[PDB]
Amino acid sequence: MSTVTTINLEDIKEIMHTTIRLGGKPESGEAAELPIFLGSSVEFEAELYDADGTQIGTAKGTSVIFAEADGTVMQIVSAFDDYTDGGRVTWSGAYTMFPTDEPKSVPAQGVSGRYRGLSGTRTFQLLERPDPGTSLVRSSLVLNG
Amino acid sequence: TTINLEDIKEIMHTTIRLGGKPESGEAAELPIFLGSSVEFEAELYDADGTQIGTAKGTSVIFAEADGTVMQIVSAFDDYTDGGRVTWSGAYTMFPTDEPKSVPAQGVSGRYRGLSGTRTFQLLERPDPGTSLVRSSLVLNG
Ligand SMILES: CC[C@@H]1C/C(C)=C/[C@@]2(C)[C@H](C)C[C@]23NC(=O)C(=C3O)C(=O)[C@@]2(C)[C@@H]3CCC[C@H](O)[C@H]3C=C[C@H]2C[C@H]1O
Numbered sequence: 322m323s324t325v326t327t328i329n330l331e332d333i334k335e336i337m338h339t340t341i342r343l344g345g346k347p348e349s350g351e352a353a354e355l356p357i358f359l360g361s362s363v364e365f366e367a368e369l370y371d372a373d374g375t376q377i378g379t380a381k382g383t384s385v386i387f388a389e390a391d392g393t394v395m396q397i398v399s400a401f402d403d404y405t406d407g408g409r410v411t412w413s414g415a416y417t418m419f420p421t422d423e424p425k426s427v428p429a430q431g432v433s434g435r436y437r438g439l440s441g442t443r444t445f446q447l448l449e450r451p452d453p454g455t456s457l458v459r460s461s462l463v464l465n466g
Numbered sequence: 467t468t469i470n471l472e473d474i475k476e477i478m479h480t481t482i483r484l485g486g487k488p489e490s491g492e493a494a495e496l497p498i499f500l501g502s503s504v505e506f507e508a509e510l511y512d513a514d515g516t517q518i519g520t521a522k523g524t525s526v527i528f529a530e531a532d533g534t535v536m537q538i539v540s541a542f543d544d545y546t547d548g549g550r551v552t553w554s555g556a557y558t559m560f561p562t563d564e565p566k567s568v569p570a571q572g573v574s575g576r577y578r579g580l581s582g583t584r585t586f587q588l589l590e591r592p593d594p595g596t597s598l599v600r601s602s603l604v605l606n607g
């Protein structure tokens with residue numbers, strides 16, 4: 322709950338390369354013996370820019386689609402940011418999928434560099450998909466502690 | 467400073483959803499499948515039976531390019547001495563009875579600012595809502 326130090330990174334421009342798999346019913350192996358489904362998944366790598374076009378870091382992570390008990394469609398992500406000043410911020414959580422163009426967020430944790438020991442929120446919002454491989458995302462990071 | 471919680475015993479309550487193809491709503495208009503998911507809550511015990519905390523999270527099934535079936539988890543422990551440790555990552559589904567681990571981040575209490583690894587291994591599944599797990603946490607920095 323303590324918020325002695327604040328880090329507030331706003332207006333991050335996140336150019337994200339998305340590798341997308343459809344998923345579905347497993348085709349072979351051990352998994353085909355079970356009544357499971359492989360969720361659609363997004364493996365992503367992104368460059369992070371400030372509003373001047375200066376790179377401030379990179380991000381990397383995986384998202385998978387699932388549904389909550391009432392049937393609300395969700396995505397779960399595990400990811401981290403590496404910033405140019407030499408520290409890492411992890412972020413992971415579940416967020417509602419629809420609408421796909423509203424802001425999403427999950428909790429974030431600073432693990433090294435100036436971020437260490439600080440916690441808060443990583444946000445991301447899809448602005449456009451210039452091609453099936455690419456997402457232009459507007460992001461922000463708020464950490465305190 | 468390093469924290470090494472060995473030999474945690476986890477009594478975990480699992481709600482499983484099988485997922486599948488969406489058949490109504492916005493999702494049915496898109497090329498997607500809902501992966502099988504495990505929502506869980508667990509009580510964490512030391513090797514004496516004393517409760518030291520609780521864990522909560524979700525795991526979801528997916529596959530990597532070469533076809534390896536994986537699970538991705540996002541979770542956190544709240545330890546009774548006041549601190550929280552988040553943990554998340556992807557691990558191989560098979561074999562289902564070997565130890566798995568993902569990265570962990572201490573965020574409050576004596577854990578704040580330390581990072582490392584959360585480990586978990588299935589011991590028994592008496593019913594589809596219940597998993598007995600053997601676990602470990604280590605953090606440093
Ligand atoms: C909840 C909506 C998300 C929010 C968002 C920005 C998330 C990410 C940054 C996530 C951390 C990695 C990510 N990047 C992504 O671009 C993304 C991702 O999950 C998508 O899911 C995708 C392609 C979708 C896939 C399935 C078929 C869909 O047709 C597809 C469409 C758009 C986004 C939807 C996104 O707007």
Ligand SMILES: CC[C@@H]1C/C(C)=C/[C@@]2(C)[C@H](C)C[C@]23NC(=O)C(=C3O)C(=O)[C@@]2(C)[C@@H]3CCC[C@H](O)[C@H]3C=C[C@H]2C[C@H]1O
Pocket residue numbers: 355357478480482502504506525537539558559560561562563566586587588591597599
């Ligand atoms: C990859 C093996 C995991 C590792 C493990 C212990 C993981 C957890 C602690 C995870 C953090 C939540 C968890 N607990 C779980 O009990 C669990 C889990 O994902 C399962 O996947 C489950 C039931 C499965 C579900 C689908 C249908 C399967 O039939 C089912 C079988 C057993 C485990 C498999 C586990 O042995």
